[PDB]
Amino acid sequence: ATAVTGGGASLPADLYKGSADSILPANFSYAVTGSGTGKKAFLENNSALFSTTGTVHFAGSDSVLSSTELNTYNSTYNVSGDANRYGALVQIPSVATSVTIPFNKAGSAVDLSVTQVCGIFSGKITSWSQLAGLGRTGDIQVVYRGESSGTSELLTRFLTSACQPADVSSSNLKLTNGVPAFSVQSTFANLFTTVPSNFIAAPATGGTALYNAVYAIDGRVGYVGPDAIPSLTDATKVAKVKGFSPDEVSVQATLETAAPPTGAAAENPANWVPVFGNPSAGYPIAGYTNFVFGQCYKNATVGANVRGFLTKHYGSTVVNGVEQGPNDVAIRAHKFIPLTKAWRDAVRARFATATNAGAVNNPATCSGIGRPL
């Protein structure tokens, strides 16, 4: 009967559940809500948000835990001397992902400059005719995620990092340094003093609904994770960005630029999720989608089920002489990017290995405590 209750981010939802090669065990549930609602469900232990009951055991999120979220959690659920405390939480990367730019406008292959992407998503560029050489005219309508979204966070971090003031001048973006500027927002609408009228919220929760809305009306552009895209390589439907399709992320210039944390740094969940807002090479919109777990669970089978999952997902196996994570074929089949060996080894050793003080349901650290039955 034992269930492991989760949900959150839509971006990795089909890798996790419902597909023949999905990677979560059968007794794990995954309610699709977007990352913001997913974080809240876990942090406030609120299963109503996942349309169910009992304890929330985990979330998927491509929005990082904030300073405020961590402090609120710690001061409520992980209080020094509190026999009723839940204990620490665990934030870990699951897979890396691109953010793709699907658009619905018939014609030749589209390759957008940073300037052009910045102009489209700021509202500076409002007509297809303003994009030189694409052979297209008519209104641009941008579809965005109304709910708090990890995909919005990944896209906006990139735009905040890469866009120059000249790329977004004469737009309704909130000011930074006296000029309109992108800022990091999981709520995309929060970028603007007033949302421009050619920006429309997707009509239902999740990236799949945004995707379908893009193709419902001519001239639309959106942003979505890669798994829902039928072909990442079809530049007549999924824009290249500075000469790169969204399967051309540079692993060297992104994942390999940060090593797993150690010591006190590893005790801080914030340090388990590096961000790469402006990669020096390759497709430039990319980052991690993550899990949030509890370190401690009063239900010991839930703890064991989590460790079991972690042992596989962050495992190591050599196949045809090449080291890989056990789930890497499934990860790539869902158009995601496997974690590097250093990161799998680090997560496995700390969180999945029951003898480590930092592991899920480590007997010493979790003695007498945990997320409730």
Q: How far apart are CA 42 and CA 60, in angstroms?
A: 10
Is residue 192 located within the same domain as residue 279? no
Q: How far apart are CA 11 and CA 239, in angstroms?
A: 18
Is residue 288 located within the same domain as residue 348? yes
**Residue 79: which CATH number?**
3.40.190.10
Structural domain for 195, as ranges: 99-247
Is residue 103 located within the same domain as residue 242? yes
Beta strand pairing status for 141-144 and 89-98? unpaired
Q: How far apart are CA 208 and CA 212, in angstroms?
A: 6
Q: How far apart are CA 257 and CA 279, in angstroms?
A: 10
Contact 56, 50 (CB under 8 A): yes
The Cβ of residue 304 has, within 10 Å, a number of other Cβ atoms equal to 15
Is residue 126 located within the same domain as residue 197? yes
Q: Which of 207, 181, 50 is nearest to 121 (CA)?
A: 181
Q: How far apart are CA 281 and CA 69, in angstroms?
A: 32
Beta bridge partners of 371: 297
Distances (CA, A) of 132 to 135, 266, 315: 8, 48, 48
Task: Judge residue 314's burial from the number of C-beta atoms within 10 Å of its C-beta, 0-12 exposed, 13-18 middle, 19 or more buried.
Answer: buried
Is residue 85 located within the same domain as residue 151? no
Is residue 84 located within the same domain as residue 118? no
**If DSSP states are collapsed to H, E and C, what string results for the chain?**
CCCEEEEECCCCHHHHCCCCCCCCCCCEEEEECCHHHHHHHHHCCCHHHHCCCCCCCEEEECCCCCHHHHHHHHHHHCCCCCCCCCCCEEEEEEEEEECECEEECCCCCCEECHHHHHHHHHCCCCEHHHCCCCCCCCECEEEECCCCCHHHHHHHHHHHHHCCHHHHCCCCECEECCEECCCCCCCHHHHECCCCCCEEECCCCCHHHHHHHHCCCCCEECCECCCCCCCCCCCCCECEECCECCCCECCCCCHHHCCCCCHHHHHCHHHHCCCCCCCCCECCCEEEEEEEEECCECCHHHHHHHHHHHHHHCCCEEECCEEECCCHHHHHHCCCECCCHHHHHHHHHHHHCCCCCCCCCCCCCCCCCCECC
Is residue 50 located within the same domain as residue 28? yes
Is residue 110 located within the same domain as residue 63? no
Q: How far apart are CA 262 and CA 237, in angstroms?
A: 43
Q: How far apart are CA 217 and CA 141, in angstroms?
A: 9
Q: Which residue has the tokens 């089949």?
A: 333
Is residue 239 located within the same domain as residue 138? yes
Total domains in the fold of the chain: 2
Final residue of a domain: which of 188, 214, 247?
247
Q: How far apart are CA 153 and CA 156, in angstroms?
A: 5
Is residue 56 located within the same domain as residue 104? no
Final residue of a domain: which of 212, 247, 282?
247
Final residue of a domain: which of 247, 277, 302?
247
Q: How far apart are CA 358 and CA 350, in angstroms?
A: 6
Distances (CA, A) of 260 to 173, 274, 292: 35, 9, 17
Contact 33, 7 (CB under 8 A): yes
Contact 194, 118 (CB under 8 A): no
Is residue 42 located within the same domain as residue 118? no
Resolution in A: 1.9
Is residue 118 located within the same domain as residue 216? yes
